[PDB]
Amino acid sequence: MLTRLGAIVQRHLQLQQQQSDKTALTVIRLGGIFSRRQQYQLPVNVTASTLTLLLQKPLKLH
Amino acid sequence: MLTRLGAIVQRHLQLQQQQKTALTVIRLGGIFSRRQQYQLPVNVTASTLTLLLQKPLKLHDMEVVHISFERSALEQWLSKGGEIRGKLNGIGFAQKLNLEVDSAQHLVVRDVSLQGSTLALPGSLPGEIKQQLEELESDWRKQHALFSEQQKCLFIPGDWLGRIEASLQDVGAQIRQAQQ
Amino acid sequence: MNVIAILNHMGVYFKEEPIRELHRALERLNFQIVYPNDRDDLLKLIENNARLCGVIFDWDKYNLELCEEISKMNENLPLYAFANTYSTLDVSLNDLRLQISFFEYALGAAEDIANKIKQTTDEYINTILPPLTKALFKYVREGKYTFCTPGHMGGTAFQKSPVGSLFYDFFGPNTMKSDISISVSELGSLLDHSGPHKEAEQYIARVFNADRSYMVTNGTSTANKIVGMYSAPAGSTILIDRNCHKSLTHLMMMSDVTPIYFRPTRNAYGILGGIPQSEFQHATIAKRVKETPNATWPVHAVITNSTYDGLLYNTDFIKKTLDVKSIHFDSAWVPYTNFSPIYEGKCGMSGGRVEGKVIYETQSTHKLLAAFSQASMIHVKGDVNEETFNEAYMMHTTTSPHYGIVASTETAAAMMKGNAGKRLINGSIERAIKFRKEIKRLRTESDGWFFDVWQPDHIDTTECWPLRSDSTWHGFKNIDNEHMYLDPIKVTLLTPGMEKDGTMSDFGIPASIVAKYLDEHGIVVEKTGPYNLLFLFSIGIDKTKALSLLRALTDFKRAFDLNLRVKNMLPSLYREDPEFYENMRIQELAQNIHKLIVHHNLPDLMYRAFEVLPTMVMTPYAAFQKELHGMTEEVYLDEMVGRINANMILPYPPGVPLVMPGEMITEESRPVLEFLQMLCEIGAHYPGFETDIHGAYRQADGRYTVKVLKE
Amino acid sequence: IDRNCHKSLTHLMMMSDVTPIYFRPTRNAYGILGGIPQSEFQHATIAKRVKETPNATWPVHAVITNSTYDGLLYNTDFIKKTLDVKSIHFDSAWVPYTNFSPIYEGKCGMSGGRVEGKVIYETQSTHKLLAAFSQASMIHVKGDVNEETFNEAYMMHTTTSPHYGIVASTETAAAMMKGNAGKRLINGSIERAIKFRKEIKRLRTESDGWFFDVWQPDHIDTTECWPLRSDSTWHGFK
C-alpha cells in the first residue's frame, strides 16, 4: 500500500502545484536589537515530523 | 556490613577530629559591606540556650550570673543588624543589652560604665553517628542470633566453623571500638 | 605621525636645493624632518620610531638595498623616492608590497609637492585604520548631533560646573566627543551588528583566522559565561577543566548542569602541568557518566589552554580523540598563536574546519595586548547557532555600550596585520630567549647561588620546547610525549631551595621574599609562592623592561651575600612592624622561613592534596539555591571536612580551586585538610607573610573560618 | 512587574522561573500612556489575580515604572502605604534629580524616610540625563535587608576588572550636583523649560495659521509639577 499511496499523493500534489500562485512562503525579518535574522518553516499548518513543500517552476536537481 | 561499618567508623573518626571554655565568634565567606556573624553550629542546637560570663556586671540595677538568648532572634541580629533583646537570669522580658563585636572575636556585653565582659558557652558521639550505629548494631545481633542456633548441623564440616565465626567476631570487635 | 626622512646626500646642487625648499614647506603643515646618515641609519628610524611615514631617497643610488629591507618591516609605508631620467625597476622588485611615489627636481614647485605628501599621508591613515575606528575619528570633527545620549554630549555639562571642568581637562576634547551611544546612524550599533559594526567582526576574524568573531565589552569573564549558556541546557553534562577561573565558577552556579572535573598533572614546584591523553578517550569519559548520578552524555568540554603558568597543549590530538561537539579552549593568555611559524597546529584557530565539532576561544584583549579594560573576543571555527548564541550576549551587556573600548578592541587586531605586527610577536620571543640565556650565563660564571629558569638544557633553537619523557627539567611523572609544550615568552624563574628529585635542601630562599624586593623598584610579580616565579613578556614589554628585571635580580644576591638589614633593604616591610623587624637581617629571615617549609613539609602536602578530587554530592547550581533562601551556617576550619561548602577555595600559593562550591570533603581527600592547616601554622609568626586564601578569612586566634550549608 | 516595561526588563522574566502579574495603566488616544490606577494597588485587586493565574503565590516583589518613557511621575506617598509589597521597585531611569528641588518632595522612593518592613530599589540611569561615560548606573537601597544575597548577583554580571574611567565619572555626577552650585543646574533647566513652554503659546495665538501645541494645562504660571486632575481636558485620560 505504500507504493500505491504514493501514486495518490503524486496525483493530488500535481493539481495543487498548478495553482500554487495564490499563497507562497514568507519568512519574517526579525531585528530590532539583534544580529543575523532567523529562518523557520510552516507552523501548525503541517502536523507531522516530515512536512511537504511545493514549487512553481520545476528544476533538475541531482 | 563491612561496606557500612567501614564507612561509619571512618565517618566517626571524621567528626571526632573536628571538635577553660570560651566562646570564639566565627565569620563566614561571601562579600559583605560590614561584618556579619553567627553562633556555633552543631555545638548548640537548643532554641533557648544559655550563655555564661566571667566577670559579673550590674545590668538593669541588678546582678546576673547567666544570660540566655533566643536562637531565632540571634540569627537575625548577627546578619541583618540592629539591636538584640535578651532576658536576664532566665526570667523577665527580653530587655535590650549593649552587645557588640569584639576585636578578639568575642561577645562583650557593655553596661553603664563601659566595662568588658567576655561571654562563654557551657560545656557538654554525634547524633548522626549514634542513629546509624544503633541500627547497624541491631542488624548484627539479628544475623548472629540465626547462626547461634543452626550451627549444630551434622552435615557441616568442622573446618568451616573456624572461618565463619572469625568473620563475625571481627566485625563485632570493630563496631564496639568506635562507640567507646 | 609626522616624521619625514631624507636619506643620503648626492653632493650635487640640483638635487639638494629642492630638498632645502621642501624643508621649509613641510614644516608649515606640522611635520618633523630628520636627516639619517648611511643605510643602517634609516633602518633604525623604523623599528624604534613608529611615527614615521615619509622616506625620501635617491632612486639611482640604493634601488635594491632599501626596497627589500623596508618591505620586510612595513608594506603600506610610503616611499617618496626621487627618480631621474635613466631610471627603471628591477626584476627582484615584483613580489614586494611597497608604496613608491615618484617626483622630480623642479624649482618653485615645492608647494605642490607638500600638498601631495599631506594627501598621501591622509590616504595612509584611512587605509591602515579599520572602518569602525576611522568613522569614530571622523564623527568627532564633523558629526555634531544634538539631543542624544549620554547627557554630557561631548563634555558640555562639564563646562558649566567648577568640579566638572577639572574632570574634562584631564582627558581631552576628543575623548568626551568619542563616547557616543546608539544615537548615531552613520556608525551603526554594536548590539545591532550592522554597518560599520558588521564589517568589523568580519575583519577581526579574518586577521586572527576565524569564521566569526565577537567584540565583548564586559571583560574576559563575560565571554566565558556566554559559551557556557549555549551547549548546556537545563539538565545536561559538561566537561569543565579542574584548573578553572573564578568566572568559570559562577558559570556552574547559574546553570542546572552536572559538570565532570578532570585530573591535570603537576610537579613539586607548583607548576600546573596538563590533562593526560587518557582522559580524552571514549572509555574514560563514559565510565564517569554512570558513576556520577544525574548525568547524561557530555555535550560540552572546557579546556584551559593554556594554563595560568604557560603550557600549551596539542590540538591536533584533541580535535580527533575528544568526541565532543563543543570543545572550549580558554585562550585568555596566548592572544598571539597565529602570526608565528612556531605556533602552527598548537591552538584552536590553527587548521581547518572539523566536521561535527567546533572550537570556542575567549582570547583576552586587555591582558597581553593594547586596549582599554573590559574587552574580550569569542573565536568560533565552524558552524554554530548564531541565532541563539548571541542571545547570551545581551544578558550581560547593556543596550548602550561604550564605543571607546570597541575602537581599541579592533585596534589590537589591526596592529597585527603586516610585517609591522609580525615583528611584535617574534620581537618578544627574541627578547625572551635572550633573557633565558643571560640567566645560564650569569649562573656558572658567578660565585655562589643564582636564579634558574625552568627550561631544558638545550635552548639554542627558536621554537616551543616539548615536554618529553626522558628529561628531568619538567619533573612530571609519566607525561605524554608530543602533548605538552613550553611557552618561550613565559619565563618561569626557579629559586634555589629544592633538589631535582622533589625533596628539600639545607640552603634555600623562598620566592615570597624575592617578590617583595621586586616591588620596591616597581616590578610587580605575576605569580609567586614556594620556589617559582612568573612574568608577562607580551608585545608591550620593550627592551627596557627586560633588561631592568635582570638588574634587580643581581642586586638581590649582593644584598644577601653581604648580610644587610631589613630596614636598609625592605622599607615597606619595615613599616608594617618596626618592633619585630628591628634587629633582623636579610639572612636571618631567609633561613627561618626555609626551616618552616621543611618542618611543615610543603611539597608533600601540596602534591597529594590536588590529585584526590572531593566527593561531589550535588550540582553546583543546587548549592546556590540554598543560599538564596538563607540556609548557610558557619563552621570552624577543621569542621568543614564532611560538609557541603558554598564558596570556592582559591589558596595562594599556588592559585587553583581546591574545593568546588558543592563538594563534600571526605576522608579520601585527607591531604586537603592537612594543606589548609599547614598554611595557617606558617603564616602566623611573621608580619607580611600571612596566608592568603580566598574563602578562609583571618580571625583573631589563628584558626580560619569558612561557610557551609545547613543540614 | 509593570506593564510599561523596558526591553531590559523583558530578559529578566526569561531568566528567573517566576510568575509575573501585569497591570493595566491608564492611557489616552495620543499614545501617551498615563500610570497605574490606585485601584490596582488594593489588597482585593492583587489577591484576585493570584487565584485566576495558575501556579502563583503571594507576590513578594513589585516593579513600578516611575517615571515612564514620556516623563510622568506617580505618587509614592500613596503607594508605600497601600501596596503591601516588602520589595517595591521604582524604575527611575529618567529622573535622576528628584531631590535637588523642593518641587520634587514626596514624589520618588528616596524622598522621605525608611518604610517599616519594606525596601525601595531604584535603578537611576547615569549616562542618560547626567554627565558621565557610557555603561554607568546606580542601585539605591532604602531598608535593612540581606546584602550578601543581593551582592552575589553583581559579580555574575560585572567582570573582575572594572574600568575606573567610568567609576570616576559615575561618582562625579553625584559631586557635580552637590551644593548650591549644582542645584542651579536643576532649577535652571526647569526655568528654561517653562520659558520654552510659554514661547509656544505666545507664538500660537499671535501667528496666522496653525502652530504647535504643548501638552500642558491652561495655567502654567506656577513653578511645580502640574497634577492631572479629573476636571481637565488637556490630559484626555478618562
Ligand SMILES: *Cc1c(COP(=O)(O)O)cnc(C)c1O
Ligand atoms: C585574568 C582572567 C580572567 C579575567 O579577565 P577580565 O577580562 O579582566 O575579566 C578570566 N579568565 C581567565 C583564565 C583569566 O586569566
